[PDB]
Amino acid sequence: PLPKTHELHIFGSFNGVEFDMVGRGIGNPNEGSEELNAKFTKGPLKFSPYILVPHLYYQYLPFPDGMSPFQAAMHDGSGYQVHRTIQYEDGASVTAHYRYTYEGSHIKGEFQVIGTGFPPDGPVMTNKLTAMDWSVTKMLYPNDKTILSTADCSYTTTAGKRYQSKMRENNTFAKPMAADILQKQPMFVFRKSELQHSKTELTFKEWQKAFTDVM
Amino acid sequence: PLPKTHELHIFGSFNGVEFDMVGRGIGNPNEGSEELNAKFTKGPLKFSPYILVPHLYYQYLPFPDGMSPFQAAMHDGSGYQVHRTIQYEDGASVTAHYRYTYEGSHIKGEFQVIGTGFPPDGPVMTNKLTAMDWSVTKMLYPNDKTILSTADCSYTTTAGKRYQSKMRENNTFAKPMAADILQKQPMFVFRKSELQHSKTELTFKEWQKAFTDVM
Amino acid sequence: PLPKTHELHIFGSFNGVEFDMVGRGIGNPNEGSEELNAKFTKGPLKFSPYILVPHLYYQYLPFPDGMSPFQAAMHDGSGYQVHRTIQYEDGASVTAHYRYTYEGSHIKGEFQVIGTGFPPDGPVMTNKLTAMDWSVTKMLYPNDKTILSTADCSYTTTAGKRYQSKMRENNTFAKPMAADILQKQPMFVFRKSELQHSKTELTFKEWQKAFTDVM
Amino acid sequence: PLPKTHELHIFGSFNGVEFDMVGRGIGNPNEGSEELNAKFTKGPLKFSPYILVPHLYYQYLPFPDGMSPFQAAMHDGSGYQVHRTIQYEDGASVTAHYRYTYEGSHIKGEFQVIGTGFPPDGPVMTNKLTAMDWSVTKMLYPNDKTILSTADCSYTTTAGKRYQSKMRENNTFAKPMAADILQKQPMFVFRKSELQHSKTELTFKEWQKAFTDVM
């Protein structure tokens, strides 16, 4: 059972201040596209909404020859969990844990996001991020139940210089990934993200494309 | 009030498997010592108990000329939160968030600890860790409510090759730290740990000593 | 002109033991292909020849809409230098500096390569590396004379487990890169490498392809 | 023999522009002190003289119970080489290789230093560094000929924020280090630095102190 709709709940804190957000979306699991609308609960954000982009659904991502491991684990209900760290060039750090429940073609996401060390005068706390650069993630399978994923991420700023980060995650599966997934390493994923936000809501879209080669 | 006793609740998961642990302890805040006993809330652990050492109370740490910022925040109840990431040389990662409540001289710790990507054949999952090397943490105060602390950590193993990690954390304070704290940077902290564990319990001791100089 | 032939001189040390290698080769600057043969002056190497892969010619890399900055800089003779760091998961490190001279369509490379801390019983020093995984490099242009390039690299080994590294470099240009090159960021590059080696010598090939998108 | 005098030759480049320095100094190998006078070869530095601090003689460093391995390698003439990498918070990097010859108690150092990616508007290239913070280096001995040393380094700057770096090195010994040295790990080294500079020259002092404990 592959997804068509999803809900999001982010909870946690930024620089010691609790925050919470809910959203709902749609996507196309055959084309790795998704979109989400989220209404900011109680007034504006005290930080750049662009910082939320990674935390705003790999179940929408197909692989070249068949289901992604993410899709397979939804389809058989065994599931996976995501444990992510992001280290920002100015010393800030975000840690995140993602858990999912499924009903038919509907995903429910419960995302714990904790951010600290954002400089009060930095681009995140002063809302100077203007967009997130397209990215390539590299995935390896150190064992049959664990994916290690790495990316070098970056945002454009109003200043003109890019705000960089290193993103690392483990994806841990309750059951082993299928042979035909494991035999194709490394696996890369190209992602494009678009965020438009106003005072009291945001609209998010992501396109993802898995590839082993470009030549 | 300075602390004299504490209790510990750790909850989270390692390699996707929930675990939970409680214990009780004592310490001397004039001398930066502590002692903790804990039982496992389910038979033996499925990983080296030595991996828990950083998660097993900086309120017991004084500074050279007065209270640590940790002590001052316990004393006036305004408090601090710890956000820690540990990256292990074999690709495992741990993220942690520490929160505290105070009842006079008593500390209640609620510690979320999430570990992923420990190789099933690695020294953590096959219990080859023998002890935690003595360590030096470097602390800087990038602003008046934030400490950034870093350390290069290592364990001895049965094979005799060290198991290394990099530890990084923010400590985020509700109230600005005192000017006299903010004046002395970098501040270093020496730590020694000992862990004795058996099948169904562990005993933990830590000594901590702040210093700006050794000459 | 665009390059058609090249020679290689690598000098430096691995774990404090000097080594030196010369080699010659050809490539197709319109397709991003190159190959190289090098005889060992003093018989089979003291470490895995696979470790040399990144050090065995971006002048053969075209860009999607015309010349790469590398090709342009060769064209006007103004040139560029590469300064590269590679950090291996077992604590080893390599630093490298590449300088080039040009005689028409022939490239002469002088590469200093210094490696240290490769454990004697590790996969490099005991020749357990079997191949270098295909890679994706992310390139940004923090200023008009500088590229910053990052890749997460990995080799296959005999014992099945991957041998990972992080590769970071600057490419520094004597004259600014063209505004047309500077406009399209990030720029990714896909690389495939092939190495075969005898007791006597080695043969190396590389295919590189630049892309801003896969969709 | 222990050292009492040294000369220095740094050669290399910063942001692809060659520089060269020669200098002369003295020190006390029983107390871990040194001083150096050094001259800028042509005109002033295009960059902060403070960036040079780590490149401006562990032979002066005694150990708590006897000679450091650095001093023992000098004494018997077998020697060691230093291979150092430094990663700066704004994306810059320096690699250095130190080689030494000895004539009795006189050291001759030949230091290759290569720096790239320092932003033209950053604190190095616009001369905003004001001092190098006191530092603690952690040393481990993964094998009997190899030290791994790590330190988190920081400078004060004119803009009211620190400029941080991560320094990593291997020190590689032509002869095995002594077992009395190999048995005590980790070993830490505390270092203090002072720098003064004019248009034509600088004066540098360092104090180093090895310690296994502070309690």
Three-state SS letters, A28-94: ECCCCEEEEEEECCCCCCCCCHHHHHHHCCHHHCECCCCECHHHHHHHCCCCEEEEEEEEECCCCEE
Contact D172 C85 (CB under 8 A): no
Beta bridge partners of D189: D137, D210
Establish if C104 touches chain D: CB-CB under 8 angstroms: no
Contacts of C74 (CB under 8 A, 6+ apart): C2, C3, C59, C100, C102, C107
Closest CA to C77 of C102, C60, C57: C102
Is the CB of residue D89 less than 8 Å away from at least one CB of chain A? yes
What does DSSP say about strands A106-116 and A5-14: parallel, antiparallel, or unpaired? parallel
Name the minimum distance, in Å, from the CA of B157 to any CA of chain C: 15
Element (H, E) at B71: helix B69-75
Give the pairing of strands D163-173 and D146-157: antiparallel
Q: Could you tell me which residues come within 8 angstroms of residue A141 by beta carbon, excluding any fewer than 6 positions away? A: A147, A148, A177, A181, A182, A185
Q: What separation in angstroms does the CA of A11 have from each of A38, A101, B120, B137? A: 13, 16, 31, 30
Query: Do the beta carbons of residue B97 and residue B82 sit within 8 Å?
Result: yes
- The residues near B188 (Cβ < 8 Å, ≥ 6 apart) are B136, B137, B138, B139, B210, B211, B212, D136
**CB < 8 Å to A164, chain D:** 91
Scored b (16 or more CB within 10 A) or e, C135-166 reads: bbbbbbbbbebbbbbbbbbbbbbeeeebbbbb
For residue B209, the cross-strand partners are B190
Per the CB < 8 A criterion, the answer to whether A19 and A42 are in contact is no
Helix or strand or coil: residue D105?
Answer: coil
- Contact list in C for residue A215 (CB cut-off 8 A) is 190, 192, 207, 209
CB contacts, 8 Å: C211 with chain A: 214
A136 with C134: Cβ contact below 8 A: no
DSSP conformation class of C58 = G
Report residue A36 as tokens: 């989400």
The C-alpha of C142 sits at a distance from chain A's nearest C-alpha, in angstroms, of: 7
CB contact (8 A) between residue B170 and residue A117: yes
Instruction: Evaluate whether A157 touches A130 at the Cβ level (below 8 Å).
Output: yes
Contact B117 A174 (CB under 8 A): no
Residue A76 tokens, joined: 């058989």
CB proximity B41 to D under 8 Å: no
| Cα–Cα distance measured from residue D135 to residue D171, given in angstroms and rounded to the nearest whole number | 18
Task: Say how many domains are in chain C.
Answer: 1
Residues from chain C that touch A185, judged by Cβ atoms under 8 A, are 133
CA dihedral C49, C28, C184, A165 (to 10 degrees): -10
The pair of three-digit structure tokens given for residue A55, joined into one six-digit string: 């935390």
Structure tokens at B30: 């004039």
**Could you tell me if D37 and D23 are in contact, meaning their C-beta atoms sit under 8 angstroms apart?**
yes
Segment holding B22, helix H or strand E: strand B17-28
Geometric angle at alpha carbon B146, from B141 and B152, rounded to 5°: 65
The answer to whether residue B175 neighbours chain A at the CB level (below 8 Å) is: no
Q: Determine the structural domain holding residue B78 and report its residue range.
A: 1-215
Q: Which chains touch B (3 or more CB pairs under 8 A)?
A: A, C, D
What letter would DSSP give residue D55? G
Residue type, D130: T
- D140 lies within 8 A of chain C by CB: no
Whether A152 contacts chain D with CB within 8 A: no
**A174/B contact by beta carbon, under 8 A:** yes
Give the three-state DSSP class for C67: coil
How was it solved?
X-ray
Cβ distance of C119 and D143 shorter than 8 Å:
yes
Residue of C17, C93, C111, C145 best to disrupt the D interface, most CBs of D under 10 A: C93
From chain D, the residues in CB contact with C13 under 8 A are: 81
Residues of A in contact with C154 (CB under 8 A): 140, 186
Question: Is D133 at the interface with chain B, CB within 8 A?
Answer: yes
Nearest to B154 among D140, D161, D211 (CB): D140
